[PDB]
Design an enzyme around this catalytic site. Structure first.
Site, PDB file in Angstrom:
ATOM      1  N   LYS A 124       0.677  -1.274   0.116  1.00 16.81           N
ATOM      2  CA  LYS A 124      -0.077   0.007  -0.120  1.00 16.81           C
ATOM      3  C   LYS A 124       0.856   1.192   0.002  1.00 16.81           C
ATOM      4  CE  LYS A 124      -1.585   2.086   3.529  1.00 16.81           C
ATOM      5  NZ  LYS A 124      -3.197   1.860   3.999  1.00 16.81           N
ATOM      6  N   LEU A 149      -7.773   6.450  11.444  1.00 16.63           N
ATOM      7  CA  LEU A 149      -8.286   4.827  10.273  1.00 16.63           C
ATOM      8  C   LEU A 149      -8.000   5.405   9.016  1.00 16.63           C
ATOM      9  CD1 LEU A 149     -11.135   3.437  12.438  1.00 16.63           C
ATOM     10  CD2 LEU A 149      -8.579   2.710  12.769  1.00 16.63           C
ATOM     11  N   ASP A 150      -7.349   4.605   8.068  1.00 13.70           N
ATOM     12  CA  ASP A 150      -7.204   4.667   6.796  1.00 13.70           C
ATOM     13  C   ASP A 150      -8.408   4.807   6.178  1.00 13.70           C
ATOM     14  OD1 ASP A 150      -6.988   1.999   6.925  1.00 13.70           O
ATOM     15  OD2 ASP A 150      -5.512   1.916   5.427  1.00 13.70           O
ATOM     16  N   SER A 151      -8.286   4.501   4.779  1.00 12.91           N
ATOM     17  CA  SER A 151      -9.569   4.187   3.919  1.00 12.91           C
ATOM     18  C   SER A 151      -9.920   2.792   3.915  1.00 12.91           C
ATOM     19  CB  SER A 151      -9.368   4.629   2.325  1.00 12.91           C
ATOM     20  OG  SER A 151      -7.882   4.283   1.861  1.00 12.91           O
ATOM     21  N   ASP A 190      -9.527   0.488   6.412  1.00 11.20           N
ATOM     22  CA  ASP A 190     -10.454   0.192   7.619  1.00 11.20           C
ATOM     23  C   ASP A 190     -11.963   0.717   7.235  1.00 11.20           C
ATOM     24  OD1 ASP A 190      -8.332  -0.977   9.083  1.00 11.20           O
ATOM     25  OD2 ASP A 190      -7.860   1.085   9.854  1.00 11.20           O
TER      26      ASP A 190
END
Ligand code: CDL
Ligand code: CDL
Ligand code: PC1
Ligand code: 3PE
Ligand code: 3PE
Ligand code: 3PE
Ligand code: 3PE
Ligand code: 3PE
Ligand code: 3PE
Ligand code: PLC
Ligand code: CHD
Ligand code: ZN
Lengths: 128, 459, 99, 174, 171, 32, 55, 88, 63, 56, 55
Positions: E44, H42-44, H46
């Site tokens: 990522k 929280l990132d995308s 999650d």
């Protein structure tokens, strides 16, 4: 080992495998902006008279008039008696008729001869 | 037959001399009385037809057609009340006068004992029919439809006039009672091959036969509601009725001259039925269906067997009360949304609950669902043709499959599904519309109790 | 414009001015009576009396008479020991064949 | 009183006697009694009431009988007043002969059901009659077409007679 | 269109639902749910366009070869068994204008309030038309999104067919 | 109301006809 | 799904019409009582029609 | 269909319940207006799994186009209430 | 739609009830006829060859 | 046979009673589902008497 | 093809087209006295020579 997915007219190529959907430039992006432009220009013309409260009627749909006008009343004016039309017309038009004529001529003539010679079983056939 | 001619004439004095707001009420009332009195013609005997005089007779072939003809005049007046509301009084009176004239000629066409009188009246039902289409149509294409209708019929009727006159000179008369006892076999020679076509072509354009059928998709589509109902119910049977009588003087040549016409009809069913699946105009789909059903009638008459002639009569009467209903049902939609396209107004079973039941009954009869008279007619033809040739089951069976596809497809596309969002003028069905469909379907189902009265003279 | 043409008149909903409309006429007095004649002559007189008249028609095409006739012949034919049905419709004593 | 027993034959009845062999009751016997009491008895009383009404006003309908007339073979060509007499009569024989065949087909169909599993053997008498009247019907009223007429039927007979009398010569002149 | 950021998320959500079908059980499913997430975290952070697209393009090829031939579909989602099961009872609200007075007198309260909503719609129409004219560019709208109301006494433009839509369970 | 110019018709030959038709059907000259 | 059932049933009904035609022509009846009594020997065609209808 | 009717209060409790069971969000610092990107880190990826958890709780999918646009428990509660037509 | 059905039922039964009542009374109190051999030297009228009382009315009055 | 005939036909007609009553509106709404179910039950018992006479 | 093109092409459209062409030849005259009368001469010479109408 991922075998290539070969498409056809009854199995469209998935959008997630089309190469053109992963190589994107500015010029390609521009088209999507304007396809959505017409896609949004027509929406409001529809939604301006769809939501009107002083309206009781149908919303004329030129996109539908053109479709049905092309399907029925605009075929002959755009017909050239070329070779493709000529051969297909003879094969599709007169072709089947010739086939069925001889399929019934042979059968009836054969069925005529048997009754002439009196070798056809018709013991209980009294309704015709 | 003067007890049905004079009253039908007296509608015109009644129509014109009535009050200005009772032309529809008076005309509809006394047309139904004439229809009521039409039942007296069922006095048929098993051996001898009913012969009133030197001009008129009524056997079992014409009795079912007379009753159907006189039973539609009351209905065509109901169907025309709406789209003539905003019409001048005098033109409304002229419109009713045209309808009454058509009934008068038809009741005489089916009773005339002389074939020349038949031709004169058989041709006189073109003037009132042509005037109704062109004057009181709606589309620009109506004018071009009247031309196709007129010249297709006359291009075949004029040769017929030269055959009947010739037959009288060489035989002695054209009275149909005489021809039974004076007919002579037709010798097989090139001269008679053209007498046969002359006598038959005039009646194979009004059925219509495949190939010679482009005037039906234009006449039955561009015509008003009254014109279409009579066009596809009472004017298509003139050709079938005429053939049932003219083939009395065409034997034994009818055995080998019918091949090019049976094959056209047997393969004309599949072709025209397939064209129904892919039509965008609801009125057009019902117009091509008529060609498919009448092709069974043409094949039935040519094969000249008792079981074909019996079913041939049933298919003609049953088809009349089905096609007329389908046009009236299709027009109810057209008087609300004002567009003949079939896909525009979908999902109408959630807005008009009762009108979605008449579609079903009309659609169920179209696809020959037993025991309605449509099935009895179609079943008998499928039995007679099998004896003519076993392989005919392949072609006749395919038609039944396709006929179920486009009849139910029409039902699904317009009725079932999700209603159209921007169609906001689907008013509740009137009593007039509901009464119009009931008068089509109730007679069409009671005949199933006593079908003998639509099976023709062979019964 | 190209000509002085009237604008297309909007459709008139018959249920507005007469909520009890039967759809026939815009005059309430006329509308009711038009419905009555359509319903009375159409249904009461044609589809009830007419059905009775067709049901009770005198023997139609003498189908019944042929039934009694056949029963008489079958009784007579079997009583006297004759064939039930001949294979010749016309007696072969009144026919003179060619040659 | 009812239908003639000679046209529609029925073999004699042979009803086995009851032969119970168990102490349990027979539901059929009881249900028959209930049927004969709550169903059969009321029906008879109403019918007898209706039956007595018809006795007060009794009248008759007669069987139409047609005096026979000269047949087509006795009619000169193009004499319509005579061909009409002969053609109408010929048609009434077409309708009657159809009913004669139908009465036979009821007999054949009745026997098969009555005989149960033993229909192949015990209905041969009915089947044989069927094969005859069908042959006779097919000789005089078949392949005449939709426009059947006395003239065509006579032509068919004169054609079969020629073959019958012709073929005999070759066979008989052995 | 779909940015590369959006494509992976769709390929992740869709890669879990199909992976859920093979495993069925919760214990087995959760075991490979974590393993799938790791394969997305292990690349990522890379910010190379060529490498990023290739993996996404290559992952889809693996996804197609492994998709369950009969994926789980929610009861009322496109293709599901209950999808559109209740479209035959969603009658448009405008049908109530055609009711007979006899069958409107049975619901005096509902038809009293409906007049209130009907009166509101007429008053708020001309304002909505005006608002769109000024904010609309010279050519025309270039995206599919309406602006909200910009003052007291107004309702959002084009609100009547989003507010009065039939309920998901009419009956 | 549909005017004559807004209906289908003969096959275009010149690029202006193609461009004009693409407007009739509400498309772009690149996709029509 | 509703139209599909009609389509497949109708294809089978070709066999049903085939059997009625054959019995009427070769036995002059539709009742099962008479068909059984006459017990046709050449019955590949009528029985295949029923087999098609059954399918 | 013989099922309990969802309520604005009831939906809110269940949205928080699923989050409180997620072993990546501190229970005490989670509220009804807790953004999952800034306020909670929280990132995308999650957020994608969070949506799947909610729909499994209610048994009706949320589209991709709308799912990415929800980053707040209040938004989740409002969106579900709009799909199920909850007015109290 | 409901109002239409009420009218159709009312009018179908407007003449249906008397016809159902009238037919029953004729059968119970007037009944059918009986088959008899034609007496010698008697010419029955043309409405004396049918069974039901109603059919013999059609023959006598109309046909 | 007298009883065998009557009870075999009454099975068929009984099943058509709910349709006939509903057509001319000679019924009571909100009870039709239990009306048609009851008709089947009584139609099941009536079919047994012909069956038993067959078994015997 | 077989309904909107060819069945229109053979009978209706081509028959009508021929009449339109013929009507042009008969009606595309120039209104000259000189040219009309010159034709009357041709008719008489044809009648007396080719067909022998003078006998
Ligand atoms: C012995 C065994 C062998 C023979 C068996 C033959 C029978 C089997 C046929 C084979 C096919 C199987 C059936 C296929 C069904 C296809 C149709 C279907 O599925 O839906 C049923 C269809 C539609 O029902 P629906 O979808 O629920 O819609 C109802 C409405 O929404 C409104 O709902 P509602 O709750 O308000 O009330 C319902 C009804 C309310 O209606 C009313 O209130 C009044 C209706 C009065 C009926 C009038 C009867 C005819 C009157 C004629 C005049 C006679 C006068 C004589 C009087 C007596 C004196 C002699 O509304 C209507 O739909 C009226 C329809 C009018 C047509 C009825 C059929 C007339 C038949 C005429 C008799 C001939 C039948 C021969 C068989 C033909 C083949 C089918 O209704 C029918 O047609 C049923 C009749 C078939 C049984
Ligand atoms: C359908 C509605 C139209 C028919 C209704 C009018 C006819 C009804 C009246 C009538 O016929 O008189 C019957 C009867 C006539 O007397 P009859 O000497 O036996 O026959 C008269 C003629 O000789 C021979 O009778 P006919 O030749 O005069 O035939 C009469 C009728 C015969 O028609 C009928 O029978 C109608 C009923 C059908 C028969 C019922 C059995 C059906 C079997 C079903 C098979 C299975 C189906 C599949 C499951 O034929 C007609 O239907 C033609 C006229 C009407 C045509 C209308 C066409 C449209 C109809 C469709 C729209 C409705 O008179 C009675 O009243 C008998 C007594 C009634 C009580 C019986 C129950 C006893 C227990 C009572 C408890 C209380 C005891 C203590 C006191
Ligand atoms: C469900 C009901 C089941 C049936 C109930 C029993 C009733 C029954 O079936 O028997 C009574 C009869 C059938 O039984 P039946 O005729 O065999 O017996 C009647 C009584 N006896 C025994 C004395 C003869 O029903 C009918 O015949 C009614 C037929 C009505 C025909 C329709 C006429 C309408 C004409 C108006 C004009 C419309 C245009 C017509 C165009 C065509 C013209 C040819
Ligand atoms: C039971 C056994 C069934 C086995 C069926 C195998 C036949 C499959 C025929 C077929 O798939 O034709 C597809 C064809 C469209 O495919 P296309 O993209 O044009 O490329 C050719 C790929 N065959 O479709 C077409 O347009 C042409 C089809 C030709 C006729 C096919 C007859 C079979
Ligand atoms: C009968 C045999 C038909 C097959 C022979 C066709 C002969 C042929 O090839 O004609 C081609 C001819 C020239 O075509 P081309 O040179 O490519 O382009 C110039 C067009 N002006 O194309 C032409 O323009 C000639 C005119 C067209 C051909 C008309 C002749 C009839 C063609 C068969 C159609 C019959 C349809 C019948 C339908 C009835 C059943 C529904
Ligand atoms: C049984 C066998 C059935 C066979 C029937 C075959 C079909 C019969 C003919 C169909 C007639 C259809 C006519 C439709 C023509 C049409 O729609 O118009 C096209 C064209 C122009 O007509 P127009 O209306 O004046 O122009 C303005 C248009 N806005 O129209 C024209 O330019 C000319 C149209 C007039 C000519 C048509 C009428 C004459 C046809 C009958 C036979 C003529 C015989 C010629 C003499 C023999 C040759 C020696
Ligand atoms: C679709 C648009 C057009 C619509 C109009 C259709 C016009 C139909 C034309 C009808 C006229 C056809 C007759 C023309 C030929 C003249 C009659 C003839 O020559 O037949 C004699 C022949 C001898 O009979 P025979 O086979 O030997 O049997 C023993 C009898 N002693 O008897 C025979 O053998 C009969 C054989 C007749 C020819 C069979 C050809 C079959 C071709 C398919 C049907 C026609 C296709 C449609 C027309 C094309 C368009
Ligand atoms: C023997 C056959 C006997 C036939 C008898 C005639 C048939 C019935 C004809 C139609 C009767 C009719 O329509 O009467 C309607 C009449 C209304 O007419 P009227 O009152 O004068 O005008 C009011 C307009 N607002 O209603 C009344 O006025 C009452
Ligand atoms: C009491 C009793 O029921 O049991 C008694 C029975 C023994 O008694 P028994 O047979 O008389 O002894 C021998 C005499 N020789 O002992 C038994 O074995 C009786 C067994 C039960 C008997 C009842 C059977 C049910 C009756 C069903 C009648 C309806 C037919 C079933 C439905 C048909 C389905 C196709
Ligand atoms: C009687 C009767 O009863 O006729 C009943 C009806 C009137 O119906 P009503 O009872 O007044 O109302 C019930 C109807 N609704 C519900 C609308 C209120 O007659 C008519 O409309 C008759 C129409 C005019 C014909 C008059 C001449 C009759 C001649 C008969 C020839 C066969
Ligand atoms: C017997 C049955 C259920 C009884 C029960 O389970 O308690 C009841 C339910 C509704 C009833 C029907 C409805 O009341 C409508 C009709 C009214 C009259 O009872 C006559 C028959 C009639 C059609 C009834 C027959 C029967 O009594 C019914 C069918
Ligand atoms: Zn309108």
């Amino acid at each position: 080992s991922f075998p290539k997915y070969e498409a056809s007219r009854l199995s469209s190529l998935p959008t997630t495998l089309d190469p053109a959907e992963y190589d994107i430039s500015s010029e390609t992006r521009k088209a999507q902006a304007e396809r959505l432009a017409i896609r949004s220009r027509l929406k409001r013309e529809y939604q301006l008279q769809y939501y009107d409260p002083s309206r009781r009627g149908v919303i004329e749909d030129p996109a539908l008039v053109r479709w049905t006008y092309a399907r029925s009343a605009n075929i002959y004016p755009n017909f050239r008696p070329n070779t493709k039309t000529s051969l297909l017309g003879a094969l599709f038009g007169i072709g089947p008729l010739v086939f069925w004529y001889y399929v019934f001529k042979t059968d009836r003539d054969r069925k005529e001869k048997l009754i002439q010679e009196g070798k056809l079983d018709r013991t209980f056939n009294i309704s015709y | 037959m003067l007890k049905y001619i004079i009253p039908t004439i007296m509608l015109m004095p009644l129509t014109w001399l009535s009050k200005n707001n009772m032309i529809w009420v008076n005309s509809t009332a006394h047309s139904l009385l004439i229809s009521f009195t039409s039942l007296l013609l069922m006095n048929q005997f098993g051996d001898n037809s009913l012969n009133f005089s030197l001009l008129f007779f009524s056997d079992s072939l014409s009795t079912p057609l007379l009753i159907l003809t006189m039973w539609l005049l009351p209905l065509m007046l109901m169907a025309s009340q709406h789209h003539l509301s905003k019409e001048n009084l005098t033109r409304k009176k002229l419109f009713i006068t045209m309808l009454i004239s058509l009934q008068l000629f038809l009741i005489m066409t089916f009773t005339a004992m002389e074939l020349i009188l038949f031709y004169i009246l058989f041709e006189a039902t073109l003037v009132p029919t042509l005037i109704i289409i062109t004057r009181w149509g709606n589309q620009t294409e109506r004018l071009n439809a009247g031309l196709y209708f007129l010249f297709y019929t006359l291009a075949g009727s004029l040769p017929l006039l030269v055959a009947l006159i010739y037959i009288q000179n060489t035989v002695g008369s054209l009275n149909f009672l005489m021809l039974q006892y004076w007919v002579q076999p037709v010798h097989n020679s090139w001269s008679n091959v053209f007498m046969w076509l002359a006598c038959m072509m005039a009646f194979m354009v009004k059925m219509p036969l495949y190939g010679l059928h482009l005037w039906l998709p234009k006449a039955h589509v561009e015509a008003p509601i009254a014109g279409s109902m009579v066009l596809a119910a009472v004017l298509l049977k003139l050709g079938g009725y005429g053939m049932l009588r003219i083939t009395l003087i065409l034997n034994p040549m009818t055995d080998f001259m019918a091949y090019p016409f049976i094959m056209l009809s047997l393969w004309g069913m599949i072709m025209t039925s397939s064209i129904c699946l892919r039509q965008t105009d609801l009125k057009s789909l019902i117009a091509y269906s008529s060609v498919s059903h009448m092709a069974l009638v043409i094949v039935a008459i040519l094969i000249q067997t008792p079981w074909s002639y019996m079913g041939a009569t049933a298919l003609m009467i049953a088809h009349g009360l089905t096609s007329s209903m389908l046009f009236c049902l299709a027009n109810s939609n057209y008087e609300r949304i004002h567009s003949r396209t079939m896909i525009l107004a979908r999902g109408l079973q959630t807005l008009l609950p009762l009108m979605a039941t008449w579609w079903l009954l009309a659609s169920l009869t179209n696809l020959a669902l037993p025991p309605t008279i449509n099935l009895i007619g179609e079943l008998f033809v499928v039995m007679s043709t099998f004896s003519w040739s076993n392989i005919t089951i392949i072609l006749m069976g395919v038609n039944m499959v396709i006929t179920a596809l486009y009849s139910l497809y029409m039902l699904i596309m317009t009725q079932r599904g999700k209603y159209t969002y921007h169609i906001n003028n689907i008013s509740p069905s009137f009593t007039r519309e509901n009464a119009l469909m009931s008068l089509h379907i109730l007679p069409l189902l009671l005949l199933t109790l006593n079908p003998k009265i639509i099976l023709g003279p062979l019964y | 414009l190209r000509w002085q043409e009237d604008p297309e008149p909007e459709d008139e909903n018959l249920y507005e001015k007469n909520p009890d409309s039967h759809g026939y006429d815009k005059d309430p007095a006329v509308d009711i009576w038009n419905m009555r004649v359509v319903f009375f002559f159409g249904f009461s007189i044609v589809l009830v009396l007419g059905s009775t008249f067709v049901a009770y028609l005198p023997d139609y095409r003498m189908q019944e008479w042929a039934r009694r006739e056949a029963e008489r012949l079958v009784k007579y034919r079997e009583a006297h020991g004759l064939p039930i049905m001949e294979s010749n419709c016309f007696d072969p004593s009144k026919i003179q064949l060619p040659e | 009183d009812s239908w003639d027993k000679d046209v529609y034959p029925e073999p004699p009845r042979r009803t086995p006697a009851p032969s119970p062999q168990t102490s349990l009751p027979n539901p059929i016997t009881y249900l028959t009694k209930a049927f004969d009491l709550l169903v059969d008895r009321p029906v008879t009383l109403v019918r007898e009431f209706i039956e007595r009404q018809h006795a007060k006003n009794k009248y008759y309908y007669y069987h139409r009988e047609f005096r026979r007339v000269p047949d087509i073979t006795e009619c000169q060509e193009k004499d319509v007043l005579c061909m009409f007499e002969a053609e109408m009569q010929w048609r009434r024989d077409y309708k009657v002969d159809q009913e004669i065949v139908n009465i036979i087909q009821e007999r054949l169909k009745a026997c098969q059901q009555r005989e149960g599993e033993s229909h192949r053997q015990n209905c041969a008498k009915e089947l044989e009659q069927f094969t005859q009247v069908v042959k006779a019907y097919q000789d005089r009223y078949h392949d005449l077409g939709a426009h059947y007429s006395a003239r065509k039927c006579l032509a068919k007979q004169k054609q079969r007679m020629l073959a019958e009398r012709k073929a005999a010569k070759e066979a008989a002149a052995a | 269109y779909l940015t590369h950021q959006q494509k992976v998320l769709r390929l992740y959500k869709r890669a879990l639902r199909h992976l859920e079908s093979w495993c069925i059980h919760r214990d087995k499913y959760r075991y490979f749910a974590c393993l799938l997430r790791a394969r997305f975290d292990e690349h990522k952070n890379e910010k190379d366009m060529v490498k990023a697209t290739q993996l996404l393009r290559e992952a889809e090829e693996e996804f197609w070869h492994g998709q369950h031939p009969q994926p789980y579909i929610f009861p009322e989602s496109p293709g599901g068994t209950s999808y559109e099961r209740y479209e035959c009872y969603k009658v448009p609200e405008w049908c109530l204008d055609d009711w007979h007075p006899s069958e409107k007198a049975m619901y005096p309260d509902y038809f009293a309030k409906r007049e209130q909503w009907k009166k509101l719609r007429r008053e708020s129409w001309e304002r909505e038309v005006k608002q769109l004219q000024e904010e609309t560019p010279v050519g025309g709208p270039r995206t599919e999104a309406l602006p909200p109301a910009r003052k007291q006494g107004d309702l959002p433009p084009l609100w009547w067919h989003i507010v009065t839509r039939p309920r998901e369970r009419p009956m | 109301h549909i005017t004559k110019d807004m209906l289908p018709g003969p096959y275009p030959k010149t690029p202006e006809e193609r461009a004009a038709a693409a407007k009739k059907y509400n498309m772009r000259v690149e996709d029509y | 799904a509703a139209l599909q059932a009609i389509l497949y049933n109708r294809i089978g009904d070709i066999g049903f019409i085939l059997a009625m035609a054959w019995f009427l022509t070769n036995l002059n009846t539709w009742d099962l009582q008479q068909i059984f009594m006459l017990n046709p020997s050449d019955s590949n065609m009528p029985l295949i029609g029923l087999a098609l209808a059954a399918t | 269909s013989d099922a309990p009717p969802l309520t604005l209060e009831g939906i809110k409790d269940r949205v928080l319940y699923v989050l409180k069971l997620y072993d990546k969000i501190d229970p005490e610092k989670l509220s009804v207006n807790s953004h999952f990107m800034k306020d909670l880190g929280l990132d995308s990826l999650d957020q994608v799994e969070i949506i799947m958890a909610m729909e499994d709780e209610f048994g009706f999918e949320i589209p991709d186009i709308d799912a990415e646009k929800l980053m707040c428990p209040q938004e989740i509660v409002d969106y579900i209430a709009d799909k199920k037509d909850v007015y109290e | 739609d409901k109002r239409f059905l009420k009218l159709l039922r009312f009018y179908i039964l407007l003449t249906g009830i008397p016809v159902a009542i009238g037919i029953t009374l004729i059968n119970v109190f007037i009944g059918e006829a009986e088959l008899a051999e034609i007496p010698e030297g008697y010419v029955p009228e043309h409405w004396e060859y049918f069974k039901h009382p109603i059919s013999r009315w059609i023959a006598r009055t109309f046909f | 046979m007298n009883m065998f005939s009557s009870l075999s036909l009454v099975t068929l007609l009984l099943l058509t009673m709910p349709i006939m009553m509903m057509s001319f509106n000679t019924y009571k709404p909100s009870n039709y589902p239990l009306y048609v179910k009851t008709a089947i039950s009584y139609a099941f018992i009536t079919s047994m008497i012909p069956t038993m006479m067959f078994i015997h | 093809l077989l309904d909107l093109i060819w069945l229109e092409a053979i009978l209706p459209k081509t028959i009508s087209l021929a009449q339109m062409k013929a009507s042009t030849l008969v009606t595309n005259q120039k209104g000259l006295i000189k040219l009309y009368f010159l034709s009357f001469l041709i008719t008489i010479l044809i009648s007396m020579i080719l067909f022998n109408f003078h006998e």
